[PDB]
Amino acid sequence: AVSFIGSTENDVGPSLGSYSRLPFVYDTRNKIGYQNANVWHISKGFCVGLDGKVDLPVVGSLDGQSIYGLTEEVGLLIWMGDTKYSRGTAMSGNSWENVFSGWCVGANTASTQGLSVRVTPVILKRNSSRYSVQKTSIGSIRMRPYNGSSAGSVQTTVNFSLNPFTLNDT
């Protein structure tokens, strides 16, 4: 079986966080992210993976993944995937993309399925010399049952919003 145990709306990164150091990528690691190991509770043979979707406009590209725009001077590189950040899948485009191939819980076991979203700020253009961004919707992630597993009427999708932040350029 499967049940939804997470939150529908989720914030990515600390509110009004400030980050210091074209296109220039800021090394924010996992600071601007959201991670939750327990979004769905699965059991008895349930097989599930994850699909991710970014709703932000694609304004460029870097090493194979999209640069999503926030403002005229600030953009983002985005990863979505399973709980552990190192499992993140680099996002491109605005379609649902497979971000976690998935796994199957044991026939006599109960476990959880989680997820993570991580972004890194990118300066597109310049100027003052600070750059502020307001809360912005990023996109969503939905569980993807497989192997004949079924979601029934269980909530399948959760959403993510980027908390406001400021970039100090010098």
* 3-state SS assignment for residue 31: coil
* Closest C-alpha among 2, 1, 12, 43 to residue 141: 12
DSSP character for 97? E
**DSSP secondary structure, 128-157, as one string:** --EEEE--EEEEEEEEEE-TT---TT---E
CA distance 168 to 43: 47
Q: How far apart are CA 30 and CA 34, in angstroms?
A: 8
Q: Which residues are annotated as a binding site for a carbohydrate?
A: 37-38, 82-83, 111-114
DSSP 3-state assignment of 86?
helix
Known binding residues are 37-38, 82-83, 111-114
Backbone angles phi, psi at 108, to 5 degrees: -125, 25
Query: For residues 46 and 154, is the Cβ–Cβ distance under 8 A?
Result: no
Compute the distance between CA of residue 76 and CA of residue 78 in angstroms, rounded to an integer.
6
Residue 155: its H or E element: none
Which pair of tokens denotes residue 69?
């725009």
Spatial distance between the Cα atoms of 141 and 97, rounded to a whole number of angstroms: 9
> Nearest Cα to 119, choosing from 83, 156, 161?
161
CA 122 remoteness from chain centre: 16
Method used to obtain the model: X-ray
Question: What Å resolution does this PDB entry report?
Answer: 1.8
CATH of 1-170, one of 2.60.40.1410, 3.30.1360.70, 1.10.630.10, 2.60.40.1120: 2.60.40.1410
Contacts of 59 (CB under 8 A, 6+ apart): 67, 68, 69, 75, 124
> How does 78-109 read in b/e, with b if 16+ C-beta sit within 10 Å?
bbbbbbeeebbbbbbeeeebebbebeebeeee
